[PDB]
């Protein structure tokens, strides 16, 4: 799957809950968790477009009222080949 | 009509298929308090140096103003800043202060700074 | 040892107090402490579902009145396999 | 390419969307993504002057409403040779 | 010395003043300085409960009016073994 | 020249635009770009006292309305030898 | 000398101005410049009590109006032996 | 394909029509038909999340006006291992 | 486990959605799915009391609006040893 | 990819725009561009059901106002095996 | 160059005029002339984005009043590699 679904949150607790609901809610692999600095934490997954749409929706709904809350929940069905250089491949 | 993981987060998700909008969008130096300078040391303009100084009036044109900013095109956006930091959280809402009711010679100063022992109890 | 209890605090002093209260209250292991940045600190514990419900409540109460305070108290009863990657295994 | 295109954002999700829109829109190379700190993420692209102008406009519009939003979208047709030392060469 | 005494301040100046006051007040060991992020700087000491009770109080009184101020002053007479892993054992 | 001129900005984009404007405006050599943290980027140049002043004023005007704006603008005609140790020498 | 002078400022430009003023005013030695995070930058000078007291007073006045201003200006005539571990030995 | 799409109906005729509409509409394998009792017949299909979404929409649109009608149309993108032993494993 | 959680729904589409939400939410083993007849499908999960509470709450919430609806959601912390005879040990 | 998505336009310039938008939007393969004759040109892509949906929406939106315009934008989740013979596999 | 500029007209006379004005005006190579059918003629040029933008504009103005006229005038700064398969490489 090449689709990218990213959910951004203020703090880590909303992000881990978002990642939990995201993965439970469809076929998606948690490729990365990035601390953006200033609080923002981004959890991003990869999978087929239909699966990523369901995963992102589940994550945004689940983590909306956890801690500070959801900042962004975005989907890119096909990230350009250049953008792959700035995306994590396996979770860390 | 059709339930499933699609119905969730109706407004939150921003993505490719449907979110994408369709067919649309006295003193020599001026008073320190009443003055603030662009350059802050050495190039400070508060003090009225008289003579052949490096200052430039309106008559001369070049090297500053529109001749620097206008070179490179730019855009600006109203993104939202919360500024989460120790300074910003200096007025964060807080719970009611712990209260000490210990009745022994405890060196219990209830007028000083808040020193919280385990559980948040004052001491 | 599958339930995940996460406490997020503004600063490290409330985080350590929350960690101490959480480990003292129930039979939970302190998996890790994370500096999320921007002043956030998250302490995660793992244990039985009942033990993590008690520990989180005990931790949340303790760190509420310490410094800037608690931002979030969350429980994940069943944690997906993928999320385990972004979950620290032991405290550095 | 000599021209430099810059887009700053508040968060990583808008930065990824901006970078994706930039690269898709025109012939630009994603030289680097930088975490400035305190929630700022800056994406840099290099290309011919015409391409960078098209890419930066696409990036600003693409990420304008995604996440916290866009801070700056800047174009530099030709940087001074000195500035070349502080610009990333390849992303990482 | 097994008790823990933590002081969290907004900036390094009150932290160093707090650190100096605590070590000068009683027989305690300065075991860590932690840049939590976003300005928060936690300095924590280990010593006897009486020694760390008198060190933390002096430190708090000294750093309260220095710089931005004092965020929290905390004492844990008995530290759970699990929490010992997330506590510094020597200055960074 | 040895006079030092520094411009501080919120975010990297105004920092790079400043550095571009200062280098192009007068005879100064860029020597560093520091990520202070919290979304602050400082660009330092070196040159003759007159040249540095002209460059810094041009840079201030240029980055004043780019992104989140300009925080500071400073020239030190002669820098004490001690402060040379906390100043970058060549951009890396 | 063992007297310690610490000046904290929001940003780096005030810190460099503060350090320059301090080292120029009195016979103090600049031992470090710490990026606390959250914007704060702390410059530490070591010298004789009389020299450090003079240096700090000059520094506080010099950087008060530069950039976002001054956060703290502190003097410690004698620093405890324990604290000197958490104090930089020389600038980097 | 691990996504599950279910379409309950009142009577068997709308169920068979829904089963025929769903399989023809997209790539979904018809896992089974269960007589729930009380005049409810459920048809379950499996496949990719995108395929199941197309199939379920087609099935619901086909059985809406057939006989007594539609009771439920649901799409589960990911099915937990526990729910497997209650679904009809054999296609026939 | 001893805790018993039951959710009754009108049809098998509302029951499967509950069963998926239950087992996903907490570590509850799905013991039975009974066709009571007359269009009632009952799902019983067995687990720890804390786990079952989370499971039943998650299960009831998920299928309240799925299909004809949720009839009831009932948690029994421990059933009488006599009632164990009328409970399903494993799913059909 | 089984799923098929066809966009038909009056002319070739809108067809090329639709093809570019489709292939950029999601992960699809441009299997053929057919000159129907009489002004119509049909660009059809193959991919997964989810990707194909996102692709055709972008293609329909992109080529709507280019040239004469758009004639039809059709999506088929899975064509019948017989129709596979009258479908291109690679562009002429 | 990779930017693609396509001009479509009713008849060959305006199409040839568009090719002449386009190639004369800027530095773009004429890559293809296509007879769509029904009277449409498409002339394709490939060059740098700035070069292509001037050429398409010149061609459109030139063929606007020659014969039946200009159906379209489109620029694609970067064409997806998939669409490269359906584009002519050189003229007939």
PDB file of C-alpha atoms in Angstrom, chain E residues 10-17 19-20 23-24 28-30 32-33 35 37-41 43 62 66-68 91-92, chain G residues 4 6-8 10 34-40 42 44 71-74 76-80 82-88:
ATOM      1  CA  UNK E  10      11.002  28.161  33.861  1.00  0.00           C
ATOM      2  CA  UNK E  11      14.561  28.612  32.627  1.00  0.00           C
ATOM      3  CA  UNK E  12      18.102  27.607  33.545  1.00  0.00           C
ATOM      4  CA  UNK E  13      18.867  30.606  35.773  1.00  0.00           C
ATOM      5  CA  UNK E  14      16.273  29.748  38.469  1.00  0.00           C
ATOM      6  CA  UNK E  15      17.259  26.088  38.126  1.00  0.00           C
ATOM      7  CA  UNK E  16      20.924  26.804  38.849  1.00  0.00           C
ATOM      8  CA  UNK E  17      19.950  29.134  41.688  1.00  0.00           C
ATOM      9  CA  UNK E  19      20.312  23.813  42.575  1.00  0.00           C
ATOM     10  CA  UNK E  20      22.828  25.962  44.451  1.00  0.00           C
ATOM     11  CA  UNK E  23      22.989  21.727  47.852  1.00  0.00           C
ATOM     12  CA  UNK E  24      24.107  24.638  50.167  1.00  0.00           C
ATOM     13  CA  UNK E  28      22.132  16.211  49.440  1.00  0.00           C
ATOM     14  CA  UNK E  29      23.578  15.100  46.108  1.00  0.00           C
ATOM     15  CA  UNK E  30      22.791  16.983  42.901  1.00  0.00           C
ATOM     16  CA  UNK E  32      20.637  15.603  37.527  1.00  0.00           C
ATOM     17  CA  UNK E  33      19.615  18.673  35.476  1.00  0.00           C
ATOM     18  CA  UNK E  35      15.916  20.203  29.996  1.00  0.00           C
ATOM     19  CA  UNK E  37      11.619  21.133  26.760  1.00  0.00           C
ATOM     20  CA  UNK E  38       9.786  24.382  26.176  1.00  0.00           C
ATOM     21  CA  UNK E  39      11.780  26.125  28.921  1.00  0.00           C
ATOM     22  CA  UNK E  40      11.046  23.718  31.805  1.00  0.00           C
ATOM     23  CA  UNK E  41      14.377  22.855  33.573  1.00  0.00           C
ATOM     24  CA  UNK E  43      16.938  19.919  38.909  1.00  0.00           C
ATOM     25  CA  UNK E  62      15.604  30.966  46.649  1.00  0.00           C
ATOM     26  CA  UNK E  66      14.513  34.573  40.145  1.00  0.00           C
ATOM     27  CA  UNK E  67      13.781  34.803  36.440  1.00  0.00           C
ATOM     28  CA  UNK E  68      10.427  33.573  35.203  1.00  0.00           C
ATOM     29  CA  UNK E  91      24.647  14.945  36.073  1.00  0.00           C
ATOM     30  CA  UNK E  92      23.910  14.738  32.298  1.00  0.00           C
TER      31      UNK E  92
ATOM     32  CA  UNK G   4      29.078  32.724  38.834  1.00  0.00           C
ATOM     33  CA  UNK G   6      24.106  33.924  34.722  1.00  0.00           C
ATOM     34  CA  UNK G   7      21.975  35.986  32.337  1.00  0.00           C
ATOM     35  CA  UNK G   8      18.917  34.463  30.660  1.00  0.00           C
ATOM     36  CA  UNK G  10      14.537  35.132  25.086  1.00  0.00           C
ATOM     37  CA  UNK G  34      23.171  27.026  26.934  1.00  0.00           C
ATOM     38  CA  UNK G  35      20.075  26.790  24.686  1.00  0.00           C
ATOM     39  CA  UNK G  36      17.505  25.982  27.444  1.00  0.00           C
ATOM     40  CA  UNK G  37      14.683  25.497  24.887  1.00  0.00           C
ATOM     41  CA  UNK G  38      11.405  27.429  24.721  1.00  0.00           C
ATOM     42  CA  UNK G  39      13.485  30.284  23.300  1.00  0.00           C
ATOM     43  CA  UNK G  40      15.548  30.931  26.464  1.00  0.00           C
ATOM     44  CA  UNK G  42      21.581  31.378  29.118  1.00  0.00           C
ATOM     45  CA  UNK G  44      27.302  31.884  32.187  1.00  0.00           C
ATOM     46  CA  UNK G  71      14.530  36.976  31.528  1.00  0.00           C
ATOM     47  CA  UNK G  72      16.960  36.871  34.459  1.00  0.00           C
ATOM     48  CA  UNK G  73      20.287  38.241  35.668  1.00  0.00           C
ATOM     49  CA  UNK G  74      21.724  36.436  38.680  1.00  0.00           C
ATOM     50  CA  UNK G  76      26.185  33.696  42.976  1.00  0.00           C
ATOM     51  CA  UNK G  77      29.280  34.755  44.901  1.00  0.00           C
ATOM     52  CA  UNK G  78      30.158  31.156  45.826  1.00  0.00           C
ATOM     53  CA  UNK G  79      28.791  28.138  43.942  1.00  0.00           C
ATOM     54  CA  UNK G  80      28.541  24.806  45.727  1.00  0.00           C
ATOM     55  CA  UNK G  82      28.042  19.903  43.561  1.00  0.00           C
ATOM     56  CA  UNK G  83      26.586  22.515  41.201  1.00  0.00           C
ATOM     57  CA  UNK G  84      29.838  22.875  39.265  1.00  0.00           C
ATOM     58  CA  UNK G  85      29.156  19.499  37.637  1.00  0.00           C
ATOM     59  CA  UNK G  86      26.041  20.931  35.958  1.00  0.00           C
ATOM     60  CA  UNK G  87      27.922  24.060  34.865  1.00  0.00           C
ATOM     61  CA  UNK G  88      29.744  24.050  31.504  1.00  0.00           C
TER      62      UNK G  88
END
